From Swiss-Prot, chain B:
Protein name (Swiss-Prot/TrEMBL): Proteasome subunit beta type-3
Function (record text): Non-catalytic component of the proteasome which degrades poly-ubiquitinated proteins in the cytoplasm and in the nucleus. It is essential for the regulated turnover of proteins and for the removal of misfolded proteins. The proteasome is a multicatalytic proteinase complex that is characterized by its ability to cleave peptides with Arg, Phe, Tyr, Leu, and Glu adjacent to the leaving group at neutral or slightly basic pH. It has an ATP-dependent proteolytic activity. This subunit may participate in the trypsin-like activity of the enzyme complex.
Gene Ontology molecular functions: endopeptidase activator activity
CDD domains: proteasome_beta_type_3 (cd03759)
UniProtKB/Swiss-Prot annotation, chain E:
GO biological process per UniProt: proteasomal ubiquitin-independent protein catabolic process; proteasome-mediated ubiquitin-dependent protein catabolic process
Family of the protein in this entry: Belongs to the peptidase T1B family.
Organism taxonomic ancestry: Eukaryota, Fungi, Dikarya, Ascomycota, Saccharomycotina
GO molecular function, one term: threonine-type endopeptidase activity
The protein, known as: Proteasome subunit beta type-2
Function in brief: The proteasome degrades poly-ubiquitinated proteins in the cytoplasm and in the nucleus. It is essential for the regulated turnover of proteins and for the removal of misfolded proteins. The proteasome is a multicatalytic proteinase complex that is characterized by its ability to cleave peptides with Arg, Phe, Tyr, Leu, and Glu adjacent to the leaving group at neutral or slightly basic pH. It has an ATP-dependent proteolytic activity.
EC numbers for this chain: 3.4.25.1
PANTHER family given in the database record: METALLOPROTEASE TLDD, PROTEASOME SUBUNIT BETA TYPE-7
Pfam families registered for this protein in UniProt: Pr_beta_C (PF12465), Proteasome (PF00227)
Quaternary context: The 26S proteasome consists of a 20S proteasome core and two 19S regulatory subunits. The 20S proteasome core is composed of 28 subunits that are arranged in four stacked rings, resulting in a barrel-shaped structure. The two end rings are each formed by seven alpha subunits, and the two central rings are each formed by seven beta subunits. The catalytic chamber with the active sites is on the inside of the barrel.
From Swiss-Prot, chain F:
Keyword Lyase annotated: no
Gene3D superfamilies cross-referenced by the UniProt entry: Glutamine Phosphoribosylpyrophosphate, subunit 1, domain 1 (3.60.20.10)
Family per similarity comment: Belongs to the peptidase T1A family.
Name of the protein in question: Proteasome subunit alpha type-3
UniProt keyword terms in alphabetical order: Cytoplasm, Isopeptide bond, Nucleus, Proteasome, Ubl conjugation
From Swiss-Prot, chain G:
Note: Present with 12000 molecules/cell in log phase SD medium.
Oligomeric and partner information: The 26S proteasome consists of a 20S proteasome core and two 19S regulatory subunits. The 20S proteasome core is composed of 28 subunits that are arranged in four stacked rings, resulting in a barrel-shaped structure. The two end rings are each formed by seven alpha subunits, and the two central rings are each formed by seven beta subunits. The catalytic chamber with the active sites is on the inside of the barrel.
Source organism superkingdom: Eukaryota
Modified how: The alpha and beta forms are probably products of the same gene with different post-translational modifications.
GO biological process, one term: proteasomal ubiquitin-independent protein catabolic process
Included range, full protein: 6 to 248 of 288
Function (record text): The proteasome degrades poly-ubiquitinated proteins in the cytoplasm and in the nucleus. It is essential for the regulated turnover of proteins and for the removal of misfolded proteins. The proteasome is a multicatalytic proteinase complex that is characterized by its ability to cleave peptides with Arg, Phe, Tyr, Leu, and Glu adjacent to the leaving group at neutral or slightly basic pH. It has an ATP-dependent proteolytic activity.
One annotated Gene Ontology cellular component of this protein: proteasome core complex, alpha-subunit complex
Similarity field: Belongs to the peptidase T1A family.
Chief localization: cytoplasm
The protein's name: Probable proteasome subunit alpha type-7
Amino acid sequence: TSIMAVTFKDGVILGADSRTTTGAYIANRVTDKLTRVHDKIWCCRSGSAADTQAIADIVQYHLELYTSQYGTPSTETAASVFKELCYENKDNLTAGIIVAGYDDKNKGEVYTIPLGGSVHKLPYAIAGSGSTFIYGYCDKNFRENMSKEETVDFIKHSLSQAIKWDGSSGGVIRMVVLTAAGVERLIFYPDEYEQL
Amino acid sequence: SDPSSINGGIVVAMTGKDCVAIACDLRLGSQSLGVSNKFEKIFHYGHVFLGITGLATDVTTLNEMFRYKTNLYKLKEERAIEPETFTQLVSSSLYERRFGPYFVGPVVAGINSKSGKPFIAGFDLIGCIDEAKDFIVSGTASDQLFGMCESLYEPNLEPEDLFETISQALLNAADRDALSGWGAVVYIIKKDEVVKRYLKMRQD
Amino acid sequence: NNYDGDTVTFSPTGRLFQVEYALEAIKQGSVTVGLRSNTHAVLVALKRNADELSSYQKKIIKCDEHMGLSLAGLAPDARVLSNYLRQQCNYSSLVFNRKLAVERAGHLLCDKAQKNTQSYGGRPYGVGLLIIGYDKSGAHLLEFQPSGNVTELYGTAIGARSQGAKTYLERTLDTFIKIDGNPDELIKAGVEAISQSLRDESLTVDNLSIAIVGKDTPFTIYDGEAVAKYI
Amino acid sequence: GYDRHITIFSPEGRLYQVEYAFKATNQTNINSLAVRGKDCTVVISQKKVPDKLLDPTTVSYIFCISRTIGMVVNGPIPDARNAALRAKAEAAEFRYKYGYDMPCDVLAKRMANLSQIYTQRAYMRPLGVILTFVSVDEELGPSIYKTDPAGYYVGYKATATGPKQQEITTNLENHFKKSKIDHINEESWEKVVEFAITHMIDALGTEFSKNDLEVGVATKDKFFTLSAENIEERLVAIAEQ
Amino acid sequence: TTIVGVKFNNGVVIAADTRSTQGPIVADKNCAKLHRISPKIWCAGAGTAADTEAVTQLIGSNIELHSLYTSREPRVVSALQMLKQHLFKYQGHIGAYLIVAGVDPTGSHLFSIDAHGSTDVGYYLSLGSGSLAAMAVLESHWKQDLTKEEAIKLASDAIQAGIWNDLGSGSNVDVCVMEIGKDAEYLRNYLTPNVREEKQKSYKFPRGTTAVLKESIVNICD
Amino acid sequence: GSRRYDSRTTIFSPEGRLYQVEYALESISHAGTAIGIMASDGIVLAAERKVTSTLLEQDTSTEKLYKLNDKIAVAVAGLTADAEILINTARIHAQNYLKTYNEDIPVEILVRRLSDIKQGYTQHGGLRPFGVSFIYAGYDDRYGYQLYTSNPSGNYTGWKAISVGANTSAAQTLLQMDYKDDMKVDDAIELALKTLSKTTDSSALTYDRLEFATIRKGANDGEVYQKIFKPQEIKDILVKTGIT
Amino acid sequence: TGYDLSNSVFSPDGRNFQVEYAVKAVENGTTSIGIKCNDGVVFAVEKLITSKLLVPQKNVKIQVVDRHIGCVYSGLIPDGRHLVNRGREEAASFKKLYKTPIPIPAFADRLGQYVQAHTLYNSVRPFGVSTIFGGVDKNGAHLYMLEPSGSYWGYKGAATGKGRQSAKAELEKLVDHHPEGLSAREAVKQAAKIIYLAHEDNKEKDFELEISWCSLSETNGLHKFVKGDLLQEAIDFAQKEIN
Amino acid sequence: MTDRYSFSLTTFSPSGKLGQIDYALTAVKQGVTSLGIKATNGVVIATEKKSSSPLAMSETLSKVSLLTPDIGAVYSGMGPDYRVLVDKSRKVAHTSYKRIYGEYPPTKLLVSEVAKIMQEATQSGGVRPFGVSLLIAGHDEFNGFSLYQVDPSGSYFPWKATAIGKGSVAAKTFLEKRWNDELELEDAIHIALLTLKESVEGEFNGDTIELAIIGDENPDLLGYTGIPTDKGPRFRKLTSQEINDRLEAL
Amino acid sequence: MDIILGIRVQDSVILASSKAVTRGISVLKDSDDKTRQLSPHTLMSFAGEAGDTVQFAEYIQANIQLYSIREDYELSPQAVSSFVRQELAKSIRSRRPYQVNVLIGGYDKKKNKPELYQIDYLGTKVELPYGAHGYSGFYTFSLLDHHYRPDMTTEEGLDLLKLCVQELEKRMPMDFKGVIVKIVDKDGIRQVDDF
Ligand SMILES: [K+]
Ligand SMILES: [Mg+2]
Ligand SMILES: [Mg+2]
Ligand SMILES: [Mg+2]
Ligand SMILES: [Mg+2]
């Protein structure tokens, strides 16, 4: 996988490729690695497909039960639940998850959770095998308080390069926009992003 | 130290016209050493016959276990268990030990007393049912038995002809296996008579 | 009446009779006194015998180098509670390298006694305790009741005829509180306090029991010829 | 007579503890009502705040169990909240285990089963509550299912619960005799709420201010409660007709 | 095994070959890899044979009890959730690779499940040792808006690719069609392109060929 | 707490009796009579069904006589539901013994274990005892034909002929009168039926109100056969002895 | 009858007499109050000075849960401590899993469910305390009062103990005279006055005043005890009003 | 806390009676009438749908329940007790039989398992007996059609025909006059409706009566085709319309 | 441990068991009796892992003796052998299995027949005219295949056994210090002192 989440003026956008593998065989070329744990709290999944799905399912359950009792959970709270599962079961998990959500008080927020189960709040986060190839690019190009169109272009160009170099990444570029306006799903096909 | 090939042995079953046959060798050894030439591998519970190859302690244990279970079945059901039902019981019982299995290759054979239909089935060590119209094989000479049966077998054989076919399948398969042989038994099963024959075979 | 069969039952006026009956066992117990200044804290206890051939039941127990108590009521219950205090004091030392605050000691005893008043099958503790100690905030005196109620005081007394000593200490409050840097005088005040609870019997050498803890004094108990000084 | 203290049978085959739990239901002296529209299910309940020192916003007997399911309770608030928390947990677990939202009637059955256990097992008392569950089920449409301390449950065209439940029940019965249908033939939930309040006013014979009522509305994909001003807006509409 | 699943206009179709192996040996020439979980939810299974049968039966049993409890027809997502959580719990040791499909009140559905617990969503899927031969065909001939008869053709063609090109697959093609508003039709041995040719010789022996030592009547009665 | 509602099922009376056991025996004394008679060449089990209704399905019915294994059967007196719990345990126990030793369980060993289970319910657990009395009829190669009885106390004894349930006092006197040691099975069949016919609370003893069974060596050579009588077979044996 | 001998048993009325008997223990206890204000809450309690021998300021009754919630109670003091110990466990596990400190309504239900659980079985006794508690969270200030039955509501002002009626009457006047709101520093002064006024119902033994507060502006949203100059200022205000 | 009731709540009285079982049977007596009749080619079970309120939808409350495709159940007594027994009965048919033998249990054995559950509520700690009598009708290959009654004690008896509940004494007498061993299924349905009218007071139609049969296999109700040996459920619940059709030729 | 043999003749079962107990490079004992009397007409010899052997033998002995007292009756050799087999069949899937191989020689008084059972540590039971455990069988089986007759006397059986011991003493690598021989017949169990 190549995955990322980026905060901007109006909120936050998540991004991901659509490739799942067993060795060099592509088991799924249209995977959806962007996953809803709450209305406006989503995550990007990387690592073991089984582990990240099982975790996301448990988190979605926890936040649904949270909402029933205490109302809408914060993005930080969601990240804490992910952490708790990842940290306490670190010996048996291979999961690299980026948590992203939109509050009206806190606006856009991004938390990344690597293998060990540590939590890191960042303006933007990149993860997955393909992220290695775009550390240079993303650091040079990211600005705070970007517009929606600028942030979409930033993620599109970034994942395009990650996909280009990483064999484990490919397919379509999925994106999920989280703002006050609501939730928007974007898709971008090879013919567009390859020739960027 | 491969549990399924310490003691040796084989079982084969075949269907004929309104009849079934099940046969087994008599050897029980400890690797190279032949120990017993009286170790029968076919058992029956009512009219349902069960043959079991593999690790001999599990053969004995499973016989005792299925006798146990079919006895309680009969007391509660007030009727003898049928081959199709017994097949399911064997599958359940083996899969119960999924991650610590009995090292066996059981084979069910018998005639359904209600429908009159001949029935045979085979299992792997962990319960997977292998149903067949023609024949089921099991044991350390299973390759040999597959080759003998697949060429010698034809459908709708008469009981007396079926006896010859299954006997020749077993004997010639056993003689190409070091761990199988030392005598043989064949069961010919009709709707309401069962004949048991001991075969003369080479004793090496 | 109908509401005293166990501790789990409230009476129609909101009383817990088993807890009150446990409180009654303390009233039958031999008198013991507690008092403190700003530098030291002192326990004085009248010991009781079965007859002239028997020993005198020990009333004072050490919990740590800086803490201990005196008992009145069921002695085995005092052994259980003191043993718990010993462990809690000890846990604080091993884990945090910290001497257990006398106040926390009181909070822990309160919560241990309380659990025995809200569950079926159990019974309340049948003993009252006077805990003295010297910690990071100076000298302390606590009064434990098996109802769970723990109270910090300048001085007090529990047991049979404890009201005599308790009145005396209430009068003497302004005097004994300022007995700083003088152990023997603080004990004398405690021995005079317990004397207000005596009837037909007087303080003898194998009858009196005194304990003291303070600024430069570990918790130590005096019996036998060591208390002859104070008679 | 210890057969009246725990849930064992009396000589006449009765469970007195269950019967006395039914009487605890009316301890709050509040009446509730539930009706179904075409697209929605409306539930209304009286709101009595006697003490001036109470924060009126925290006084509620309507609960949002899940996004789709709402529940109103007739009975003391401690037992009411006990039931609500369990219902929420059950609905959440159902979704996790079986991959879809717990239906209103299935939750009702589950809570009813739990209530049944308390009528058979001695160490557990029955909860002195009647639980009315409402939703717009994705299969069965607008739904009202009600549970009691006996462990009984059933679906309803409409229902009412409380001390003056019988008056409201017959009032609704007489309307459905007239209309000849199973529901309120109305497009918007706003007017179904207006119907619910109108018929409660007629049956109880009392007028309501904005703070005398409590309203829950179930539509497709969400159940929500109304604010005081939402109800006031609704009360004005009734008065101007 | 080769197994596939293909979505169409008004439902979903799954298919499978019928070979069962023990190493290089064909143990069963006509085994059933299409499993009924509920009347209108069926499962194609590859991997350890006993595992795919057992896990499909267990979840099928629990689905039946659930359907009775809820007074509702079971949903594919329920079978999907129950299967994946069971398989995840066993960390891959239960070697079941499943294609789950069916119709329910929500619509028609097609999913896949890996032994470790991961699930996929798609219009076309293939699993097992012949999945690459099958997927090659699916990727070549699949399109949006397939009819029923087109989807059956595509599915069985994908299985055939496995039968001919994968040594792990062989014999026959089983099919199950699950259409919305209709009964699911299980087509056992839909294609049988591997019939054994006539043998050159009858190996029926002259009676008395086998030497016998003893005879006896066996008592099966009480 | 819950002490208030505890009946204390496993305590002694001031006279040294077990209340619940005594009261369970009182319950059993109202159950339909069951008789066991042991002959030199077999055993008879006879039992009276509890006041029958004409719409009861008589042939596919079992209330009194149950099969434990091929060599052992029991006649029941008391709560049927309680008896079935114990019967399933006894059946399993017999199979455990067979699995262990590859030999059919000796009758006494089975009887002892079932009686030991009953005993347990009278000494610990705070549960009510089983309201059941059994007549065990069986064969093994050590003692041959054997009759036993067990009751809620968990006490068991061996018999030549015995009755349980209703009117045992009258039934035992009649058995004691006409029983002799050199008796045959067919004579015992007659004695069993004659005794029930005289002790019955019904107007007249008919086939539909009886369950009957024999355990003979009347199979072919040195082996035992259990015969649970069919309705028509009871009708015939009732005519053959001239009761109807 | 006998319906009142066992907890969790319904009477023919539909009442749990054992809980009502626990309420009698609460009514027997000392007065405690809670006042909700502009951006927080204020708690106060009456401490009866049984003897001269009691060390002043050193038998603290108000308890903190987490760092933002205060709890006070009337009735059986040990029962109140048990409830707070549970409250602290509940608040710790909330913060452990969800990171954010426990909201006051969330905390209120945790106590409520726990107390309610002690009316479900005959093997436990109901709590012999009414508990007034609250604090400041993300949605502002909240004040609650919880009773032996498990019943709790949000309050503008709350009171319990032997002088509850006197305190309630005084609380109602503040609500009427201050519709816009009461300030934190004002509420501290008023709390002192009300405890002194409620002491008329327990006037044999004289008493010691204890106050605490949480305020977004005054204490930065954390629970603190009122001590020293601010306490004495509040005492003087109360003294001036009784005369 | 914890269940301290580890002792029996049903015990023998000096007279030998088991009080709670007797009182449970009394609760069954108060319950609405239900009946069952066995024909040569089927079994019918029936009961009145006593509506609690006219606003209640009596279709949502099912008194007649499918246990297996070939077994159905009805009751008299306490509804909630029946509902949980049906849940338990359905599960035990799977866990203790189908998951072992790969087929559904025969009627007598499923009944035996339900009886066991009810017996345990008579002896186990801290529980009362179930306040219901069940009538279980079913079919299986080797026993054919059968009808069983299960009482609170755990006792069960096979019946040609019987009734339980409110007006059982009169209903049983009615069935004795009409029942013969040559009854066809349609004749048994007719007698069931006649017998039930005697005990029903108010409305007597397909909306107030609940009736199901155990008869021929129903391939149309199976939900799939392709397996010859699977031929469909023998249990079928008669519709409201199907009942009214038979009430005209009554 | 090491050498245990068994021969069933017309009227008796004869068990021969080596006397040596070796640990490392030292023969610690040369008079060890590797047998336990389970009942008056049933004898069990054993060989295998150190400690396990005697612990298992005595555990079986206790159980059979317990049965004998309870029922006032002697279990048949067949019944005893089946009990022993099941215990070993349980053992093999335990956390630490008994590594013990046994021969059970008994005289069935009801049948008036000698019986010899060979059971290995896996729980593999067979009834045999002659049996052996370990490497002994690799010499004795073929020898007995040649010289054994089913109608032999006890004296003939002892001579047949002498022939086995002689062969083992000639071709076996280790010194097993001779054998203790015991006879099981209608009159019970007795030991031959001069072998
Ligand atoms: K297969
Ligand atoms: Mg790439
Ligand atoms: Mg060979
Ligand atoms: Mg109860
Ligand atoms: Mg061996």
